[PDB]
Structures are given as C-alpha cells and as structure tokens.
Amino acid sequence: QDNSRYTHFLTQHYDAKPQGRDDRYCESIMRRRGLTSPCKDINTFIHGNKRSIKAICENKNGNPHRENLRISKSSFQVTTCKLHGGSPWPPCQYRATAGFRNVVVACENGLPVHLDQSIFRRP
Amino acid sequence: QDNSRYTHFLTQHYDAKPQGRDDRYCESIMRRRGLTSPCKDINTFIHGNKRSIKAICENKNGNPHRENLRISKSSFQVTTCKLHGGSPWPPCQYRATAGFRNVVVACENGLPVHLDQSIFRRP
Numbered sequence: 636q637d638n639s640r641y642t643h644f645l646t647q648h649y650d651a652k653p654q655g656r657d658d659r660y661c662e663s664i665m666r667r668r669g670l671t672s673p674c675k676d677i678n679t680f681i682h683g684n685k686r687s688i689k690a691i692c693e694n695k696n697g698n699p700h701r702e703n704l705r706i707s708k709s710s711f712q713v714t715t716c717k718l719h720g721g722s723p724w725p726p727c728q729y730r731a732t733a734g735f736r737n738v739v740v741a742c743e744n745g746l747p748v749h750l751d752q753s754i755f756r757r758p
Numbered sequence: 759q760d761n762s763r764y765t766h767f768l769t770q771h772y773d774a775k776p777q778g779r780d781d782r783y784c785e786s787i788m789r790r791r792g793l794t795s796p797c798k799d800i801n802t803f804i805h806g807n808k809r810s811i812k813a814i815c816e817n818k819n820g821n822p823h824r825e826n827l828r829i830s831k832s833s834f835q836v837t838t839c840k841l842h843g844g845s846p847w848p849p850c851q852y853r854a855t856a857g858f859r860n861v862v863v864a865c866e867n868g869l870p871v872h873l874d875q876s877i878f879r880r881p
Contacts, residue, residue, distance in 0.1 A: 698858060700858075706833075706858055707833070708832065708833050709831065709832065709833070710829075710830070710831050710832070710833065710860045735821060735829055736859065736860060737833045737859060737860060757880075757881075758880075758881040
C-alpha cells in the first residue's frame with residue numbers, strides 16, 4: 636500500500652514533455668500506460684514538472700475545493716484523451732484535446748492521489 | 759471611441775469584492791450594471807484586482823489562445839449568472855455559479871476589451 640497511490644497518479648496522469656498532443660499521442664500513451672486494459676473512456680495527462688503538481692496540496696499552489704478535494708491556483712498544460720468508438724475492448728481509438736487550465740486533485744499525506752475527471756467532460 | 763471598450767469590460771465583467779455570490783447577487787448586479795436591458799442570457803463577473811486582469815495581455819499573466827485571444831496563467835474567482843426562465847424581458851431571474859478558473863479575454867492596446875463566455879457554458 637504505502638505511497639503506491641501517488642505513483643498510480645503519476646502513471647495515469649502525468650506526462651512531463653509530450654511532443655504533438657494529437658489523436659496518435661493519446662493512443663500510444665494510453666496503450667503505453669496500461670489504460671487500454673479495457674479502454675478507459677476518458678483520461679487526462681498533466682504536463683510540466685512534478686514539483687508544481689505536488690504543491691497543489693499545500694496552500695502554495697492549492698485551494699480547498701468541494702468535499703475533500705483541492706484545486707490549483709496555477710494553470711497546467713493538459714491533454715485529454717477521449718474514447719471514440721462505443722466499445723471498451725481494443726482497438727482503442729482516442730480523440731485528443733489539448734488544453735491549459737487549473738486542475739482538481741485529491742491529496743493524501745501531501746501527495747496527489749486522485750485527479751477529478753469531470754472538469755474535462757466538455758460538451 | 760478611445761479606451762471606452764475597456765471600461766465596458768470592467769462594467770460588464772469586473773466586480774472587485776462581492777459578498778455572497780448567490781442567485782440574489784446575480785440579480786442585483788445584472789440590474790445594477792444595465793445588463794437586464796433585455797435580459798443577457800449568461801454573463802460572468804471576475805473578482806479581485808484589476809492589475810491582474812490587465813496583465814493577461816502581457817506575457818506576465820498571459821498566453822496566446824486560438825485566433826486573436828489570450829488565456830490567463832493565474833486563476834481568478836469568478837461568478838457566472840445564468841438566465842433561468844426562457845423570456846428576455848424583465849423580470850430577469852438569474853441563477854449563480856461561483857467558480858475558480860483562468861480566463862480567456864481579448865486584448866486591445868494592452869487592455870482587456872472582451873471576455874470569452876463560452877468557457878462558462880458548463881452542461
């Protein structure tokens with residue numbers, strides 16, 4: 636158990652320096668990150684440095700948000716990959732949306748351990 | 759003409775220190791700001807200091823965004839008032855949504871002169 640929740644976050648939600656944040660980017664990193672296991676219908680990767688993600692947990696770069704979450708004060712480059720086919724089983728075709736926005740995470744012992752995906756469900 | 763576009767922005771989109779950002783807040787400031795003229799279906803007020811809004815235009819607190827817009831790097835407390843009745847004519851009942859997010863504006867001669875409202879149309 637111990638700490639393994641943060642490195643799950645970093646594996647599902649952090650990509651430090653991506654190159655083109657396109658449909659093909661979504662498809663290779665979703666498959667490189669295990670998230671095609673069944674096909675995750677939507678998932679967002681945060682870019683930039685870990686230091687800035689991790690500080691959302693402190694009042695340096697964090698604000699309290701709803702019940703038990705935190706929302707960042709600074710904005711992050713983000714890429715949301717969306718399933719675009721109706722079936723959960725491979726092949727997993729993903730559509731990409733690059734964005735720049737602040738992020739809502741959950742913190743545990745001063746470490747991000749959950750990303751709230753609802754703010755990236757844009758209609 | 760001269761500068762009058764920025765003070766239109768500040769009049770429709772800036773409220774420095776609001777108290778409760780509730781349904782009744784939306785209704786009195788929409789009516790206090792002339793925006794009930796016919797009832798504007800949706801409008802967002804930014805809070806905090808003017809200095810920080812105005813710097814979105816520089817690369818200090820700004821990033822280039824889409825064709826001709828800028829998006830802020832820092833987040834702002836925001837309150838969106840939404841028309842909730844189907845008629846454009848008074849009485850104008852508004853529903854409020856408080857938020858914390860970065861903002862997309864248009865700049866003219868280093869002054870914000872347009873707020874893009876589409877990012878506040880959340881489904």
